[PDB]
Amino acid sequence: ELRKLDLPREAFEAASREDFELQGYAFEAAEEQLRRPRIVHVGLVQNRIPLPANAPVAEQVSALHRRIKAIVEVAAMCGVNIICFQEAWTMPFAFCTREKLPWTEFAESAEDGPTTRFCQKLAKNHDMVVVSPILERDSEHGDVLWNTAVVISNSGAVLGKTRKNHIPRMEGNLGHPVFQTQFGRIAVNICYGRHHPLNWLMYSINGAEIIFNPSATIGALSESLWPIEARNAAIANHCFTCAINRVGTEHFPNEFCSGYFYGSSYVAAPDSSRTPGLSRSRDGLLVAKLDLNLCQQVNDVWNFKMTGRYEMYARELAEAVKSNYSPTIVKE
Amino acid sequence: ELRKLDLPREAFEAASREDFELQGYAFEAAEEQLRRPRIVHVGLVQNRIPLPANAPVAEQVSALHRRIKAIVEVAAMCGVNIICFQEAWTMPFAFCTREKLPWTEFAESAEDGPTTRFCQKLAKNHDMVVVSPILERDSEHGDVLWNTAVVISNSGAVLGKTRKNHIPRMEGNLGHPVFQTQFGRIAVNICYGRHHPLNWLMYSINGAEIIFNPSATIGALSESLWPIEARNAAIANHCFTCAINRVGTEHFPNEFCSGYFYGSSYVAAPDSSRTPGLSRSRDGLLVAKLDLNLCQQVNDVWNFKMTGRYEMYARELAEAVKSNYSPTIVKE
């Protein structure tokens, strides 16, 4: 049972006026202050698309920008230092991506498209790091489309970008970057990548203290997996994880790729504790106070990085991927 | 909510007489029989040591053999094909292992010590594969001690052995063997190895359909992790996992290495479903009917082996383990 944050009255009033859920929790070290507190407040935003999926793209996108602006203003009242939006936050979701409409109209330059420029202004204005998952057009490489997250500094400068490494059956070509911010080292595991323990691992190995998982996912099976995967990744990697899913029923028609999004955004910690999920249907802001030195408390008990034998696994995996690999199997 | 098995009256009577909990559950494919059923019944045994930790070793061990025999007889009434015992099942547990008493008296030959020979007789008598986690003396290699599990065929023949790959701060030197049995391909993730997603992964890659996790673990933190780790490993690897922990308070004195064991053995499935745990205090037998072709149903939705990019991770991990590795980190 995590301590609830005494979020300001002004924030609660604004969230009520703006019709979104506001929740706040703390993950704090043991009362005895053995080590230094390394406190960062994170914000997770889940929302439905404001306009119908067929609405003009300029209008859909600007309506989403205005919606997020209102929520981030409340996040700032609560002292959020790092905020992350949901997967493909400026568009209706569809299971697939193709090089035709509507995708090609929604797609933007990661470095200087209107959503990134909007986020730079937000970030600077509230002294807040902003993580923006978008559909990217890479104009330097043939206009190919990527599922990309852009990381914006609290100074308003673009820190860089990270791409979706795992795609259900466009696979990310940027490895596992970690962004050093004023408020901690962060990484972004996009959507379906939550299903791959190795994806979480490489971000942690490269130094991530917080791994965000912006997702856009539907159905009974996905919802059953939702409370387990991101939660386990926090434990296994001694880090914090932030699971985000959108809400609402609106979608591009299923004929576009030939859906019900369940929200339930949450934060999980290195000690196995987690926040209650946000609503399954309502727009929402989850504020979490993280002590990033909590891992040091966990590491008095176990250190999985020290006992991981990663050099051994590198060798075993390399052997396993070979085309002539006969598995290590014993028979009578 | 899993279907409970209608275990025979005789089994319930015997379990009552013998003072252990008996539970039975089914993990079945969707009613529509699209594919073939591949049905195996597994048994998980948790127990306390019968005699005080200081009791003579021959007596402690033979009392444990007699206890397990009574439970396995009930397992056979229930149609169990593969049974697994808890970590170091023939001895009191201690956090450490040293090359002195009491450990050196408890330790045995994996190939032909009295516990393995006992298991060969059990296995043959009930047509049951038996997985026996013991403390091994390796006499061919300087009498060094290992945390080892011996896998015995339903014919009574020794199939081979597997060693504990991960040790808290003796690290296993046998890789990730998988045992092909008449009732499926199995592997053993011993104890603390449950904390390492890569350990589970390599067993699955090498072909395991069921990964047993015999453990001996105590404390509030461990119990908090218990429902998450083995459960996630079933999901990530599209397999069944079997989490086993001992019960009782008895232990070697803490001064030996300078404890309360919580049971709660359970089975987790590729669809994220799991059994309710066995008792936190009572001896127990959990029977689970597994359809090993359930993964094929899950793989109509997602196949994580196909989307895992293991060749890419082999390369990234190898680079990461190097002594001169500067992580992939982006700064302003």
UniProtKB/Swiss-Prot annotation, chains A, B:
Sequence ranges assigned to domain CN hydrolase in this UniProt record: 40-292
Active-site residues annotated for this sequence: 87 (proton acceptor), 164 (proton donor), 191 (nucleophile)
pH dependence: Optimum pH is 6.5.
UniProt record, GO biological process: beta-alanine biosynthetic process via 3-ureidopropionate; CMP catabolic process; dCMP catabolic process; dUMP catabolic process; in utero embryonic development; liver development; protein homooligomerization; protein homotetramerization
Locations listed in the record: Cytoplasm
Activity modulation notes: Strongly inhibited by 50 mM Zn(2+). Not inhibited by EDTA. Competitively inhibited by beta-alanine, 5-aminolevulinic acid (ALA), beta-aminoisobutyrate and 4-ureidobutyrate.
Effect the entry attributes to changing residue 194 to W: In UPB1D; complete loss of activity
Record-level GO cellular component terms: cytosol; extracellular exosome
Effect listed in the UniProt record for changing residue 53 to E: In UPB1D; complete loss of activity
Mutagenesis / variant outcome for changing residue 193 to R: In UPB1D; complete loss of activity
Tissue occurrence: Detected in liver (at protein level).
The keyword Transmembrane helix belongs to this UniProt entry's keyword annotation: no
Residues with Phosphoserine modification: 326
Highest taxon of source: Eukaryota
EC number(s) reported in the record: 3.5.1.6
Pfam family, one: CN_hydrolase
Reactions catalysed: 3-(carbamoylamino)propanoate + H2O + 2 H(+) = beta-alanine + NH4(+) + CO2; 3-(carbamoylamino)-2-methylpropanoate + H2O + 2 H(+) = (R)-3-amino-2-methylpropanoate + NH4(+) + CO2
Keyword list, A-Z: Cytoplasm, Disease variant, Hydrolase, Phosphoprotein
Pathway assigned to this chain's UniProt record: Amino-acid biosynthesis; beta-alanine biosynthesis
Gene3D superfamilies: Carbon-nitrogen hydrolase
CDD domains in UniProt: ML_beta-AS
Medical condition linked: Beta-ureidopropionase deficiency: An inborn error of metabolism due to a defect in pyrimidine degradation. It is characterized by muscular hypotonia, dystonic movements, scoliosis, microcephaly and severe developmental delay. Patients show strongly elevated levels of N-carbamyl-beta-alanine and N-carbamyl-beta-aminoisobutyric acid in plasma, cerebrospinal fluid and urine.
Assembly and binders: Homodimer, homotetramer, homooctamer; can also form higher homooligomers.
UniProt function note: Catalyzes a late step in pyrimidine degradation. Converts N-carbamoyl-beta-alanine (3-ureidopropanoate) into beta-alanine, ammonia and carbon dioxide. Likewise, converts N-carbamoyl-beta-aminoisobutyrate (3-ureidoisobutyrate) into beta-aminoisobutyrate, ammonia and carbon dioxide.
Name under which the protein is recorded: Beta-ureidopropionase
Organism: Homo sapiens (Human)
Gene name of the encoded protein: UPB1
